[PDB]
Amino acid sequence: DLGKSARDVFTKGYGFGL
Amino acid sequence: SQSNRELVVDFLSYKLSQKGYSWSQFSGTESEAVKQALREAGDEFELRYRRAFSDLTSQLHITPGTAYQSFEQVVNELFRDGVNWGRIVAFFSFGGALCVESVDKEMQVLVSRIAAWMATYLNDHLEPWIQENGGWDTFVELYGNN
């Protein structure tokens, strides 16, 4: 799953709504 | 949108040169400031997190068959929690890493496509946030060295 793969590559791309 | 294409091509050209793809390839002041700030931010990002985007084309199956909407789908995961300047920098750095890797793996055809994909993604997905958050002149104020 591309989406899963992507999520791995960008694990550190998290944060808030704001 | 033309300025978005130019920013993408400036950044990717910079990253390819910096890695020494001057030889895999046959060889305003307001916008200059934007380009320089983005180059420096992308360098900073890469110095901070350079394990982050290794072996991309393999993990993401980016090939000469890949269509824009697969790139879009991947990048959407980067902005899953919303857009900010740090993730926009990450986006540019990702694209740069994809370009370098593509050249390294003898898939040079991808460089012009990645640049088109980034410009589209910027215009359609990121520009609406940018134009609510001060535009690139505000990015310069935040991340420009000077």
Author numbering:
A (entry chain B): 570 to 587
B (entry chain A): 2 to 28, 80 to 198
What does the paper behind this entry write?
VDAC1 is a porin composed of a 19-strand β-barrel and an N-terminal α-helix (VDAC1-N) attached to the inside of the pore. In addition to its role in mitochondrial metabolite transport, VDAC1 has also been implicated as a key player in programmed cell death. Biochemical assays demonstrate that VDAC1-N exhibits a pro-apoptotic function by promoting pore formation of the executor Bcl2 protein Bak via neutralization of BclxL.
This construct allowed for crystal formation of suitable quality for a high-resolution structure determination by X-ray diffraction. However, the binding site of VDAC1-N is shifted toward the periphery of the BclxL binding groove yet overlapping with the BH3 site. In our X-ray structure, VDAC1-N forms an amphipathic helix with the side chains of Leu10, Ser13, Asp16, Val17, and Phe18 facing the BclxL binding groove. To validate the structural model of the complex, we performed alanine scanning experiments where every individual residue in the binding region of VDAC1-N was mutated to alanine, followed by NMR-detected affinity measurements with each peptide. Leu10 is the only large hydrophobic residue in VDAC1-N that is establishing a hydrophobic interaction with the BH3 binding groove in BclxL, thus markedly contributing to the overall binding affinity.
